[PDB]
């Protein structure tokens, strides 16, 4: 499905430090780091996707462990875990033990909190979401003319908010 692949791509964007993620309507998923390294994300199975670069065929694998739980493992073995706690709340856990909890505050506002107390907020508008912390990191999601995400930095809670937004958009991001 498109939703699994979108979630896998956002998780890989964190694990590989992507600065940009582009998903086209035909399904191509490309991640770019701030210095220009490219990765591709491909669905191999229901609930299985891999991240490929030109030098390394499989740098990370994402697996749907359960209907509410997704796991991404890099080649070197570090793990990034997505746990949907409720239709409006999820938990993101990295292999170093940091966590971020994201939740819907109101129809157009979402908020996330990390382990050390940092907070971020997402503001939704038709065709777009704008994510900002007090820590100054920003991210933008555009799904109006399939989806693009631009990251100023790689924060765990910004990623958790993007994952919650993707989970709530469903098929609204198909084209």
């Amino acid at each position: 499905s498109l939703l699994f692949l979108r979630l896998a791509a956002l998780l890989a964007s964190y694990a590989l430090g992507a600065s940009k993620l582009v998903i086209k309507r035909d399904g191509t998923v490309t991640l770019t780091t701030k210095d220009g390294e490219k990765y591709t994300v491909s669905q191999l199975a229901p609930g299985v996707a891999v991240v490929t670069s030109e030098k390394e065929p499989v740098v990370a694998t994402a697996r749907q462990l359960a209907p509410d739980e997704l796991l991404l493992t890099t080649k070197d073995g570090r793990k990034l875990r997505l746990r949907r706690l409720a239709p409006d709340e999820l938990l993101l856990t990295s292999s170093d033990g940091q966590k971020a909890r994201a939740r819907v505050l109101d129809p157009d506002t979402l908020e996330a909190t990390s382990s050390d107390g940092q907070k971020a907020r997402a503001r939704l508008s038709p065709g777009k979401a704008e994510i900002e912390s007090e820590d100054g990191a920003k991210a933008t999601l555009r799904y109006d003319p399939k989806t693009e995400v631009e990251l100023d930095e790689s924060r765990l809670e910004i990623t958790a908010l993007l994952l919650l937004i993707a989970l709530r958009l469903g098929s609204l991001e198909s084209s």
Side-chain angles (χ1 to χ4, degrees), residues 17-134 136-145 147-152 154-167:
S19 78
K20 177 175 65 263
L21 159 62
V22 183
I23 306 173
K24 337 224 170 153
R25 29 169 317 190
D26 68 14
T28 315
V29 175
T30 304
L31 300 149
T32 307
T33 77
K34 206 197 304 185
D35 76 53
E37 336 204 332
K38 322 256 180 314
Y39 301 89
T40 307
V41 190
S42 325
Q43 181 143 9
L44 309 185
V48 178
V50 289
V51 182
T52 293
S53 89
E54 208 71 78
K55 69 134 300 172
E56 214 149 24
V58 175
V59 311
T61 306
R63 317 154 196 69
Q64 186 100 47
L65 300 189
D68 73 304
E69 186 144 344
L70 242 186
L71 170 71
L72 180 95
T73 317
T74 58
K75 181 145 210 329
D76 40 309
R78 49 208 335 171
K79 324 191 82 162
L80 185 60
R81 190 176 302 276
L82 175 57
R83 227 160 56 111
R84 179 167 209 176
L85 291 166
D88 55 286
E89 146 174 33
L90 59 76
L91 189 91
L92 180 55
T93 301
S94 70
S95 50
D96 35 60
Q98 324 153 117
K99 329 206 182 93
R101 183 193 46 199
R103 72 178 307 130
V104 168
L105 304 206
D106 84 326
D108 75 335
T109 311
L110 304 100
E111 187 149 80
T113 303
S114 69
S115 279
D116 57 32
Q118 289 172 287
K119 281 206 253 83
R121 62 179 310 228
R123 280 309 260 81
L124 311 186
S125 113
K128 110 180 85 249
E130 302 265 46
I131 303 183
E132 168 145 50
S133 71
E134 290 69 326
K138 284 188 236 313
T140 299
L141 190 162
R142 298 257 218 280
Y143 59 93
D144 202 87
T147 163
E148 174 204 50
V149 173
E150 162 68 48
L151 307 104
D152 280 24
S154 21
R155 173 74 232 163
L156 185 79
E157 51 182 13
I158 289 183
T159 293
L161 290 167
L162 285 158
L163 287 161
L164 186 46
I165 289 156
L167 269 156

